[PDB]
Design a protein around this ligand. Structure first.
Ligand SMILES: *C[C@@](*)(O)[C@H](CCCNC(N)=[NH2+])NC(=O)[C@@H]1CCCN1C(=O)[C@H](N)Cc1ccccc1
Lengths: 29, 252
């Protein structure tokens, strides 16, 4: 998978974007 | 994108804009899957009912863009197309089944903080993430409301839940297939949002809870109106068409 899907300004910097937690929480709800 | 919000800069580095050269016309969205390949919806290139049938020389793509009201010098990149490949069984006559196309760039694009490829799903990813109730994210420069400004300057983003197939099927008289899935909130769920005309070809992405990577599970394909209660947007099921994608790239 090389570096696919890891954003330079987010994942690569251990920074979360403003709404991605809504996606992670949807795996429960 | 209806009822979405402005994207943060660099939030969707695989976002691609597909343009008609002349006259200048933003046609659709697309996504970057490697430094030379871009994924999009077939109907953005071929749709005989609307007298649409573009060749490589009629188009161009812009990569790494955030705002349309600013020329992002040396960040955004324009690329010419070497070849277009439309799925051979793309059903433009009826229901847009297999609404997918690949475009090879004449020259590779350089990755940067603003240009980076999205992952394509494999069997394990499709089985674990493509489930009703789970939310994915759709992005685009398409219409802000069901119509015809009304088009955004900044890339729009909206998170939407995948909908159970029987609900998708009963929501429309158009025949749905296993090569599609639908998403959107149900009536009175407390939230709204949808892709819309102009958003086609854009990615429906999901973040893996296991490796932190973004996977493109769908391609904005069709709908009836935008954001209407009881209707849902439909997306090309990318994993279902993965074998075809691999075949095209392996052979080019
Ligand atoms: C090409 C895209 O920009 C656009 C996306 C619309 C997404 N809408 C919602 N609510 N999520 N697709 C289209 O406009 C496609 C192309 C062919 C016509 N079309 C439609 O969505 C029609 N509204 C419905 C339809 C007609 C014929 C075959 C399939 C669907």
């Amino acid at each position: 998978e090389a570096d696919c899907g890891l954003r330079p300004l987010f994942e690569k910097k251990s920074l979360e974007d403003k709404t991605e937690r809504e996606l992670l929480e949807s795996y429960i709800d | 994108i209806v009822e979405g919000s402005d994207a943060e800069i660099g939030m969707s580095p695989w976002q691609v804009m597909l343009f008609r050269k002349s006259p200048q016309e933003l046609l659709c969205g697309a996504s970057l899957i490697s430094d030379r390949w871009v994924l999009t919806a077939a109907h953005c290139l071929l749709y005989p009912p609307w007298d649409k049938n573009f060749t490589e020389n009629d188009l161009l793509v812009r990569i790494g863009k955030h705002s349309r009201t600013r020329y992002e010098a040396n960040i955004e990149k324009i690329s010419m197309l070497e070849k277009i490949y439309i799925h051979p069984r793309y059903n433009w006559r009826e229901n847009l089944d297999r609404d997918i196309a690949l475009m090879k760039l004449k020259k590779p694009v350089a990755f940067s903080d603003y240009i980076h490829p999205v992952c394509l799903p494999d069997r394990e990813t499709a089985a674990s993430l493509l489930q009703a109730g789970y939310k994915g994210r759709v992005t685009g420069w398409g219409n802000l409301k069901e119509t015809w400004k009304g088009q955004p300057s900044v890339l729009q983003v909206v998170n939407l839940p995948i909908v159970e197939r029987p609900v998708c099927k009963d929501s429309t008289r158009i025949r749905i297939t296993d090569n599609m899935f639908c998403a959107g909130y149900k009536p009175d769920e407390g939230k709204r949002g949808d892709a819309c005309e102009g958003d086609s070809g854009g990615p429906f992405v999901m973040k893996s809870p296991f490796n932190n990577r973004w996977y493109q599970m769908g391609i904005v394909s069709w709908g009836e109106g935008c954001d209407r209660d009881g209707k849902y947007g439909f997306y090309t099921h990318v994993f279902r068409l993965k074998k075809w994608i691999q075949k095209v790239i392996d052979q080019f």
